[PDB]
Design a protein around this ligand. Sequence first.
Ligand code: SF4
Ligand code: SF4
Ligand code: FES
Ligand code: FES
Lengths: 633, 633
Amino acid sequence: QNLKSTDRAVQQMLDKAKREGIQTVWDRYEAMKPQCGFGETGLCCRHCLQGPCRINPFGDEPKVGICGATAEVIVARGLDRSIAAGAAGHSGHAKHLAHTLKKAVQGKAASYMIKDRTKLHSIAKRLGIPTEGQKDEDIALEVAKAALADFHEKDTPVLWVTTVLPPSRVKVLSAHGLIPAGIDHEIAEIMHRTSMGCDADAQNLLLGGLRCSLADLAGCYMGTDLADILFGTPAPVVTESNLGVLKADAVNVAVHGHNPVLSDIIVSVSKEMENEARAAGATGINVVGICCTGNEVLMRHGIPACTHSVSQEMAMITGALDAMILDYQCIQPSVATIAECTGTTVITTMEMSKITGATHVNFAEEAAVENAKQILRLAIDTFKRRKGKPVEIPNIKTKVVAGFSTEAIINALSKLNANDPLKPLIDNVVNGNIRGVCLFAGCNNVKVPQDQNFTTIARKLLKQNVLVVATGCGAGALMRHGFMDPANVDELCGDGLKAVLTAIGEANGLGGPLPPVLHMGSCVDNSRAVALVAALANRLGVDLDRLPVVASAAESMHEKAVAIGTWAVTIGLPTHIGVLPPITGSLPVTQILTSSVKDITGGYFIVELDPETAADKLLAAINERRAGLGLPW
Amino acid sequence: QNLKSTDRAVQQMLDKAKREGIQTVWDRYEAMKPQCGFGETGLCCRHCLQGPCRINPFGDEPKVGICGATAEVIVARGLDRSIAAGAAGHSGHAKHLAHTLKKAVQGKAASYMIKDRTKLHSIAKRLGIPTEGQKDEDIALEVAKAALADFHEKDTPVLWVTTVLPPSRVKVLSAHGLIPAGIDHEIAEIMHRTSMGCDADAQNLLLGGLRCSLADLAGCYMGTDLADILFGTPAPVVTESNLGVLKADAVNVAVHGHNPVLSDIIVSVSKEMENEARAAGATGINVVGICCTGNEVLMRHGIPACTHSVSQEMAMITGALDAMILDYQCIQPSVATIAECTGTTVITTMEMSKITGATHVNFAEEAAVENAKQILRLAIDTFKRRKGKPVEIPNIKTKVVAGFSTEAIINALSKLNANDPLKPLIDNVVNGNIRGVCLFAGCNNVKVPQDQNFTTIARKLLKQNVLVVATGCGAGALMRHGFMDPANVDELCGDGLKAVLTAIGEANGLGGPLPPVLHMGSCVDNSRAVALVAALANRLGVDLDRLPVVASAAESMHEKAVAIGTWAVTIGLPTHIGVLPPITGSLPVTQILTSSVKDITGGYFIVELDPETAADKLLAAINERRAGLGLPW
Ligand code: SF4
Ligand code: SF4
Ligand code: FES
Ligand code: FES
């Protein structure tokens, strides 16, 4: 089970699933081998009914699509659609939050409100929305209207791109025509241009893809902005992670998905429901997190993270998961089937994300508390049905210090320099105590022993004094292996990095360092890392492609992660991907994405499936940036 | 060559391409056999990097996707993305026209103007835009703004759906939540909900698809509306079709693609350029049409149609095609490669549709006449390079009577009943002279001997007195085989249909009948058939799913045709498709699309690959509707 997951709690549940005959994601993967090499390489096209077309990577015919589409066209078109799908997910999430804020300040959903008034005003100012003499509800209405306006063409480009990157970076992108005109506009233009008999030039196709990835970035940043306004900006929190956060004697309720519009409500209402749970024989309601919705309520409320990504079925295999409350994205639909064996009540809540066999609750912001109570009462009913039964919760968990929003990081740094908070960070980059910054983002992927790439790469970078930040299930992987426990700083961090983490932590009164890795939140909260990197670029007076900052999607799977990797490249970062993307079927496409895009945006992809090698390549990229700034390395 | 195309001119060019060693679409098809059965059946998923996943249609594992996605989920998700891509193409076309109208009436592009003032006012009235006391330029500005507004969420649903279907049909659709909220909004929601770990219920997925297909219908209808305003509503015209419309001694210029924003300009400017062409040694400039842009200028100007769809390479094989001017959609990118052998200058004009090796001209409405002159001068240069050379233009063409916009059809009927023009049509439906109406739409497809399904089905329906209307390359197939020549009415039409066609034609002064098939225009002009069917429904006081009206996508290929077929089903029509769509891998999906959707919208798909059988099934569907209205059959 060690070849499936490096997580010991997951291994224990895989043994339980095996002896109970419950098929897992790893079993379904084994049943799929060998996988199709045309698809793996990207040399397959089904964009019209003359297809499917395939191209042999090497050898004899077929060498070209039926319509004449070349390998480079087919590969670039498929990649573009993946970027568009990723953009559609992040921006649907943001769109939902924009409508929630609008309803809240028009008096249509009293369960929602402006919780972070300071963030509201800063966003409005960044957007050019006047605040002086205005009511908060009017400013927020204007912010929500501006958010919804960025989805379509208008007098301005997408402001959640042009107002969040430095002017020098926006100029570079505008010169190549890469600034999105509208978020859903770009998604649709990708689907048009990649349909049959349309765009058939790999360079033109990929430039369209870069622009669509900036539409995804805008969705991410808008999602983070709006959730912070509605639910509060994260500040440092201490909690726990892994399956041992389930409690046999409590009603265990997992929030799972990405959009916390309901799950933030679930957290608040579950406290109100405690006595009702106690009357049922439980100690209380134990809300735990799965995937990015779990990250959202971990960041803001300290809700412990149960598990992530590829191993999400294992939470149910314990026998103690009374309910799993789903919104959308990255939910394995197997959970609906597994629930018949484990007793878990799986509940969908969003109209456009239903799973055959799961109970659906039609959540509406107008009825959010009432929906939450209906959902939690199903969970309490489920706990009663297992009162007495034996469960197997692995007694395995880690300590997690998290909640490092960019505002929180700036505040923490401000204890070392009040009026120039970025300077202590840059000082230590310059003097070598901090070699560079690496963002770990993205998913787990069944092809990769779970967490192996994230932890192998992270260990090597931390020893070389790289400041490591993490989001999504990359944060999940590192959190479950102790990388967010400050007690592991001595073991994990090089001397220079340790000195910096200790100095900042002691100055924030902690008596100990910051954790080895800074948890910056959910997948949309990759936008927080952009905010930090852009602030560093502005403070240094350089563009992002001169900073010693890299990204690693070390184990990625979702189309959303393809979009994020592409916009990391587009804003200027060396961007590692640790699984094979479907580009190896076209050498020209691969050369554009890993080499010649350097000449356009300054960023580039680093495809490397071996984690030790990937870490060396990421260190080389960081050290090249150091050399270009004239620094020692 | 008879197994490749039933078009004798295409057969002659296939012989020329064969002996000259020029690879064709049919050769590339042969090189692709056998095609992938997982893709053919829809049982393949590449929506995340854990893939590709496939499911054996029958037998042992794999039986399920790695994430747990079932065959029915995988099939429905792939279908939904095809609908979204189709919607993105038709609505990008419409969006382009909306921006062109806006620029024109704001004084930004003097080559464009309000040509059909009557259509402008009727559209405005249908939209609720006040016209009394308003300048035309202000009304048109309001119309263009309303068009662009339908792409995003707003206070109203998509008006190019809700204002173009009868209230009873809109009520049926609203009751099932099928009315689109915004065109690009729906496209993005499809891409989100079909991404990994999102919607996983086949019924929910397909209902989303029906709603997205209505977004495609809105794009089609908006495209037709705006092009009519800008370029004029079609009225009956006489021209010719097939390769024999090329002229060895003229500069032959093909307009190819879908959006006639530039090609309508090409038509006007080419007349201005005649003396320049003559000075080069040509008789003049011979503009001819390929695919739907050719249909647009055929409908409005009588430009002869050179060829269509699968056989588009053959126009170049003549040796006489000096230029091929491309916008986007359904252009085989092989043309850029074939051009190196044939001498043709292939020119792209749209930023998001480029082809490696083709010359690009950056068309802009602001510079439209100047761009047109640059393009035509490349064509004249190309004619000079072949002055003297031998060409092989098959001396094969047909007579084509076309231009039957819905306004033209109503006008023609008004000569038999001035104040109630639909009544003579309904009278003859009721008394049996017209058994029903069949719309032929969609593409050719290399899997089907070119035009075989369109003509086989059309012959059987016409003998049974069905009124046949046609668009796109279905109109192209029928036009090239003589179905738009009134001289073939006696041979092709049953006695009742002949009587009606003769009566209408004689009353319009023709001295002979209307043609056997009524050409209603381009693929977006499928919206014209909706306008006619909706007017018939309103006049009869029934919903569309009670009319004896059917549709046949007899040889379809493009994602656009998948979207059109789906919205034909969604507005209530029995809808035949004559190629295998990737749904046969899921019996539940197939049952929804061919049977249970009857209970939702009243329409349904008829999948039938054998054309004789398809015609019987379409006749049965028409006759069932007749019986439901109490009519003899
Ligand atoms: S678009 Fe071209 S390559 Fe793709 S399936 Fe159709 S014919 Fe084949
Ligand atoms: S979304 Fe599911 S079925 Fe599709 S490729 Fe990913 S794991 Fe396989
Ligand atoms: S041939 Fe396997 S992915 Fe298409
Ligand atoms: S396995 Fe052939 S289409 Fe994917």
